[model samples]
Target: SLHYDSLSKVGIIKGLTYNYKIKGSPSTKLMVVKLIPNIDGVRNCTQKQFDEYKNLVKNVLEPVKLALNAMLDNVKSCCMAGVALGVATAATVTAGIALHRSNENAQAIANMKNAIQNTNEAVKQLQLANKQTLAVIDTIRGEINNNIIPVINQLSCDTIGLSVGIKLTQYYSEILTAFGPALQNPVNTRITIQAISSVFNRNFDELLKIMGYTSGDLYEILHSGLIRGNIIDVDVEAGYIALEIEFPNLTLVPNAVVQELMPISYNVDGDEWVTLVPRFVLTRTTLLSNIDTSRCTVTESSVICDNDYALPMSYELIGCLQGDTSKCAREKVVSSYVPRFALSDGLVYANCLNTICRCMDTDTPISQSLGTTVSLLDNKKCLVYQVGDILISVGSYLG
Candidate 1:
């Protein structure tokens, strides 16, 4: 018999498990569990299994990882994350297409499946980042409406016919044109939002130059908070002015290599189910401080800091039927966000937006606290709240 550690081994498999007592079951709902891999299973693997594992990692996993890394590395703006995701997704799909043509290559086919899983995981991560970035951009736009626009109104009062509001709206169209179809799809709407930042910077500077205001002349204006908006700091010299604000860092990095398997039923009401053994999401952690760090154990294996402190972006673990397929046993996260059209009414990235989810029979509500549970029949909604007691409602419902 082959000894597990004595022989050359690649790695071990692991999964996330949750314990919940049903209405009929006597089992107590306690601490969440992580299923450790059995050494016997690792040792009993044939050479063929080893070859497939090696091929999967090298051909599918490594190349896909590289592509994701490249796309993320090339992200120039916060809005560009989605564009990068689309590009990489396309690249992976092309790879899958190529692999499928060689029908005899078992490893190629295996990698194709792996590629889809890996690529889809990236899509989810980028989707969250993209939404978070949009929230920040929307906040900045609100600041512009409240702070910067009035300043522009005062300056543009001398102009003929068109008012500052009208001209500014025209400028909005101008900046949006800088972004094309990417903005139209809403996937890359953040890029257009960033363009708003660009336009403001240039026009504000031009306003200073054309109005013949020196650094000393503009001192009172900058300090008054009228032009500050999100611009925390300003520097004015001659015809140039620099606007600086806390543009939240919106990048995600892969956190771990462990794969967690979750069970899925074809129909929530039916008995037929499948547990995805190899279906692992390549977990990506973002650099944004919006995450509620206290709730997440940074040192824990499957823990991720995803709960947004600034917006409705949340990480909810919905419960699912397990074992004999009767009770709520599994937990999962489904990313949800406000619709793109809502950006027009100035409800961009609505604060109370609930992350989308699917659960077993019962609609799985968000797990606010780590061990919190919901009734098997009724579901709960999540509300986004910030520190320092500020409550902003995103929709009609409140919890």
Candidate 2:
């Protein structure tokens, strides 16, 4: 009766419609033939009675009928499920969009909160910089106020900057030049505070001059500028060099001076040292295990130490010696802070030194490692080649 190619043909019951899914002998589809009259062939005559055959189909093939019904039920159930799934998909998409938009809005609010906090702190720091700068304008209101190649008083190295008489500045520089180079004097001209204290059986302060530092010695060093610009050179030791270099020009002290390592705060606060003067002790004084004091002397106010190995600890200095201090400075200078000198990295090379040991662009520290050739380099500008030659003396091989 069906005209279309439908899922199942209805020539038989649903059980037979499942024939495509079932495999059977050809006899299953065949009708009993030539047994009786036309209509009688279907029911009346066969090797088996029709009643009996109907019973076989009802009893034995019952499960096949149930399978077809189950298959049809499942197909209908799947069709309804597919429609529900489409609705579920739309619901999920809408929910996902709402969740994403809400998340972004929450994040934007959090970001705005953070931005508010940032601006709150910005004002605080801004006011602080403004406060400090107010005082700095007063600092320069003085160039017209009081300026000169004055005495600096890091309590010593040019303390209390004194403006010089313009007419006498050059002559004054020449006069102070006599004291520029240093040599062994009041102290052993060697050694550090802690080692001296251990050997002398004295505390750090007693090792220092209870009598106080020498006069004119301090005066000349305070004026130890290589030449007479506002830049002054000086030393802690009355010698050619000060040990803590990266300097204004005192070049001699090395290993001999003490570096008081200090710490700083994140807020740019400075350190608190017990005193600016390093402690000292007598060479003749003995620790239970002191080295020989044969070359050391014990005067009423001096201890003359000559050995190089005796210090709290060993400190080493590294650099290419252009053999000229001035030559190195021009290459190394990043900033010239009033009294402070900086290196190429823009860090203060020497700060808070009891004594500074650095040669001036013009000052010549005695070449320590003996040399064979001597280049009479005068008015020495910083030379880039052959940086610091101690013994190579002369190689003008005129090549």
Itemize residue pairs with steric clashes in candidate 1: 336-356
Residue 345 lDDT (model 2): 17
Segments of candidate 1 deviating more than 4 angstroms:
1-160, 163-165, 168-230, 233-255, 258-270, 273-399
The candidate maximizing lDDT is 1
lDDT per model, in order?
0.26, 0.22
Query: Candidate 2 on 1-399: residue-level lDDT in tens?
Result: 111111011000111010000111111000000101111111222224333433532443334334323323333454323443344454443333332333332233233322222331101111221121000001111221233212222222222222212212332233223212212121112223333223222232332232233333432222222111110111111111111101122232222321111211110122211211112211212221122223333333222332322433111101111112112111222232222211211112222221122344335443311121111221233221122222112222222
All models, RMSD in angstroms: 30.2, 51.0
Model 1 error, position 306 (Å): 7.8
Q: What 10-residue stretch in candidate 1 is worst by lDDT?
A: 28-37
Candidate 1 is scored at a TM of: 0.18
TM-score of each: 0.18, 0.12
lDDT of 1 by residue, 1-399 (tens): 112111111111123422111111111100000001111212222234334433432332233334333433444334235554554455444433332322222222222332222331101111221121111112223333455355654543333123323333443454345433322332111231233335444333433332234534543322222232111111111111111211122122334232233222221221222222223323324321123334332333332322222222222211111122222223232322212111111111211112222233333432322221211111133233221123232332222
